[PDB]
Structures are given as structure tokens and as C-alpha cells.
Design a protein around this ligand. Structure first.
Ligand code: HEM
Ligand SMILES: CC1(C)[C@@H]2CC[C@@]1(C)C(=O)C2
Ligand SMILES: [C-]#N
Length: 408
């Protein structure tokens, strides 16, 4: 049974569309495909759905980009739907606007900046090779369970100085943050609340132990950056370290699954990467354009008209980032990966002050993964008649990716 809310007085009937971000129409065909169904040639730039507590959805890339770049008009005070979940959400600094946001972002950047991430290349490669070597000679693997859910998690837990055996419990918390269970706004709010609490419970002892610590791990490094000349307060630290874990353990895992399903179906594209290693390197951003996974929100700060649409203070707008990268008004033949595409502009990492702090790490993990994968398994396909299983929500997910190849 689908939970509906009535439209508020300012929402006109002609803008209503029945879109369920947590179970998109057509999702069985793919997450990206399902979002693209919403972006028809004449669909309005902003549409309102009665599902998920009632909210707007931006349907074109230019709006998504603008909204992310405009924190004074579209606040991060709520960035999740349903509203109840967004109000429960307590991660730092994603819940903050400038100026409060900026010293926390500075702190994160001390740990995640490009120069720091470059130092991690060898560690990341070692992890990728070890995993791949486990099945390269076999001729098959279930890529989800055997690689994409393993590689980025081992990388991040190592970087954060955390035990690899915590992967399961942290993954379960992540799932309930980005794809909270429930079929009512209130149920989903309770799910997210519980997940966010689990994260705080996990991180609290780590923070206490690493304040003033001598560890060289990511958490000690970021935790001990002063905020306005003083140690970071406990409340902020909980949200910050939890966010690092959430970002570190969910997004790349799911990105890789979508990417690999596509590559398994496009052997010509794989072959280009194999024949031209610089095309691979230079082509990774095209992959980010093509395989967006985040659909999150902003809070309308003031009554306004935006792209011909009347918005009220407190309205939530969902930003399905796939609808920037895959917008046919921005990219010709948007569903094809063209490694030589000159303009790859996208909002896969959002825009504005919150533009992903992990983007350098994400790019490196993907680059290294592809390099070490193709070195060892140069050709591969999706098992005949296999059907991946798709999930939509704040972060998309995919499972069941059985790959096959002739061992080299
Ligand atoms: C495929 C990979 C990734 C994608 C698509 C992605 C996407 C995003 C997006 C869209 C945002 C903006 C959220 C918002 O403000 O609405 C963001 C923020 C963030 N991401 Fe990522 N992310 C990825 C990987 C990572 C990794 C590996 C980390 C490592 C911890 C990370 C850490 C963060 C952090 C800390 C922020 C908050 C930045 C701020 O508020 O200033 N992300 N990410
Ligand atoms: C939507 C996000 C990708 C962004 C960073 C991690 C994530 C799940 C958040 O909580 C904010
Ligand atoms: C970012 N996650």
C-alpha cells in the first residue's frame, strides 16, 4: 500500500507526479533507467510527489546544479526525504550551511585532500589486487558480494584504522541511513533515527580514544583539527566521524556495481580501456557522469519563485543527481559512456560548498580498480539471462552481478 499526503495549497495539480524515490517505477530495469523515465521531453523542471511525505523533485541538470550552489536559498538544514528522516539526520558537516559548515569542511579536507589521497594509491592497489587474485583464475565471480562490497570497505576501514570485522555492522547501519526501512514517513524516520544512533554508539569510544591521539589514521587526523581555536565539541565530532564512515563505506560500493554492469555489457568500451591506458585514466570522470548514485535534498529557505515554480519556505526538493549527468539537454547520447567525451559536467559529487569531500578518494579507488581488474581479467561478460536487483533511495544500490570470463 502506498502512503500519500495531500498537496499543499501552493502546489498546482498540473505539477503533481507520482514518483517514489524509494521504489521507482521501472526500477527493475535499472536505477538510472528508472530516473530517466521521470525526465520526459516536456516534463516540468520541478514536480511534486505525494509519496515519501510529499516533496518536490528537480528534473533537469541546470536546476540540480543551481540548487546545490545556492545554500542561501536552499539550505542543508534538511537533506533527506521523508522530512521525518531528514530531521532525525545528524551527520556533520552535511547538515550545516556556511559559515558553520566551513571549519568542519576544512578539517575533513586536512585528511581527504588530493595530495593526501595520492599517498594512498599503493595501499588501495594492494587491496584491489589481493581481492582480484582470489577469483581471476576462476572464470567467474559474483561481483557485488565478492568485489564491490569488499574493496572500498577494506580500503576505508584500513584508512580509518578500524577493524575489518566491523564491516558487516557498519554496512547494516549505512543501509538504514540511505535506504531506511518502512512504508510510512514516520516509519522511515524511526529507521534513520535508529541507524544514526547506531553510528554514534560506534563512534563515541573511538573519538574519546583518539582525541589528542598519536595515530596516523584518518579519524585521528581529522578529529584533532581545531575548530575556531578549540577542540571540536563532542556533538559535532560524533556527527563528523559517523559521516566519514557512511560516505566511506556506501557510495563507492554502489557506484562500482552500476559501472561494472555497464562495462560487462559493453566489451568494446572495455577494450578501449585495455588498449589505451591513458583513455582509462582520463575517462574515469565520464564514468562518474554516467553512474550517479545519490538523490538527496535541500530545504527552501524562503517563499520564492524558482524556474517558474512557486515554492514555500520549508518545502523539500529532491535532487536526483543522475538527472544532471544523464540530462540529454546537457549531454548528447547521455546513456553511452564515451571515454573521449570533452564535457562530462555532472553533479554526481553535487556542487557548491558540500561538493563531495571524498571525490579524490572515489576517483582513485575507481581508477585503481579498473587498472588492476583489466590487467588480470581483460575481457568479461554478465552471465546469460542474469538479472541484477536494484534499490532506489537516498543512495542507490544494486546486487546480483554474476560475471564470467575465460581465465587468461
Ligand atoms: C562514488 C562515490 C561518491 C559519490 C557519488 C559521493 C557523493 C557525494 C555527494 C552528492 C555529496 C554531497 C551531499 C550533500 O551535501 O547533499 C557528498 C558529500 C560528502 N562525501 Fe561523498 N561521494 C562519494 C564518495 C565519498 C567517499 C569515498 C568519501 C570518504 C569519506 C566521501 C565523503 C563525503 C563527505 C565527508 C561529504 C560531505 C562534504 C561536506 O558536507 O562538505 N564521499 N558525497
Ligand atoms: C548522501 C550522502 C552521499 C552524503 C554523504 C554521505 C551520504 C550518505 C550522506 O549522509 C551525505
Ligand atoms: C559521499 N558519500
Amino acid at each position: 500500500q502506498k502512503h500519500r499526503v495531500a498537496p499543499p495549497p501552493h502546489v498546482p495539480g498540473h505539477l503533481i507526479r507520482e514518483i517514489d524515490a524509494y521504489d521507482l517505477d521501472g526500477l527493475e530495469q535499472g536505477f538510472h533507467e528508472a530516473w530517466k523515465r521521470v525526465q520526459q521531453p516536456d516534463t516540468p523542471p520541478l514536480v511534486w510527489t505525494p509519496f515519501t511525505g510529499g516533496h518536490w523533485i528537480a528534473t533537469r541538470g541546470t536546476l540540480i546544479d543551481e540548487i546545490y550552489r545556492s545554500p542561501e536559498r536552499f539550505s542543508s538544514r534538511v537533506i533527506w526525504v521523508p522530512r521525518e528522516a531528514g530531521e532525525a539526520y545528524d551527520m556533520v558537516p552535511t547538515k550545516l550551511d556556511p559559515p558553520e559548515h566551513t571549519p568542519y569542511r576544512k578539517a575533513i579536507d586536512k585528511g581527504l585532500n588530493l595530495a593526501e589521497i595520492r599517498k594512498l594509491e599503493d595501499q588501495i592497489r594492494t587491496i584491489a589486487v589481493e581481492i582480484i587474485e582470489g577469483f581471476a583464475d576462476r572464470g567467474h565471480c559474483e561481483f557485488g558480494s565478492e568485489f564491490s562490497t569488499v574493496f572500498p570497505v577494506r580500503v576505508f576501514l584500513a584508512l580509518a584504522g578500524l577493524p575489518v570485522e566491523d564491516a558487516t555492522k557498519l554496512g547494516l547501519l549505512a543501509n538504514e541511513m540511505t535506504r531506511p526501512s518502512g512504508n510510512t514517513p514516520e516509519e522511515q524516520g524511526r529507521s534513520l533515527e535508529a541507524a544514526n544512533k547506531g553510528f554514534f554508539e560506534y563512534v563515541a569510544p573511538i573519538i574519546a580514544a583518539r582525541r589528542g591521539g598519536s595515530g596516523t589514521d584518518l579519524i585521528t587526523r581529522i578529529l584533532n583539527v581545531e575548530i575556531d581555536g578549540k577542540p571540536m565539541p563532542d556533538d559535532r565530532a560524533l556527527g563528523l566521524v559517523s559521516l566519514l564512515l557512511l560516505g566511506g563505506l556506501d557510495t563507492v560500493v554502489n557506484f562500482l556495481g552500476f559501472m561494472m554492469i555497464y562495462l560487462s555489457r559493453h566489451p568494446e568500451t572495455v577494450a578501449e580501456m585495455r588498449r589505451e591506458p591513458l583513455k582509462l585514466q582520463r575517462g574515469v570522470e565520464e564514468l562518474f557522469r554516467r553512474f550517479a548514485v545519490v538523490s538527496d535534498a535541500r530545504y527552501v529557505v524562503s517563499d520564492m519563485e524558482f524556474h517558474g515554480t512557486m515554492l514555500k519556505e520549508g518545502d523539500l526538493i529532491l535532487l536526483p543527481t543522475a538527472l544532471h549527468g544523464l540530462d540529454d539537454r546537457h549531454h548528447d547520447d547521455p546513456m553511452t559512456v564515451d571515454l573521449s567525451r570533452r564535457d562530462v559536467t555532472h553533479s554526481t559529487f553535487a556542487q557548491g560548498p558540500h561538493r563531495c569531500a571524498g571525490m579524490h578518494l572515489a576517483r582513485l579507488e575507481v581508477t585503481v580498480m579498473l587498472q588492476e581488474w583489466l590487467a588480470r581479467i581483460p575481457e568479461f561478460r554478465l552471465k546469460d539471462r542474469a538479472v541484477p536487483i536494484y534499490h532506489s533511495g537516498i543512495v542507490a544500490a544494486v546486487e546480483n552481478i554474476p560475471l564470467e570470463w575465460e581465465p587468461q
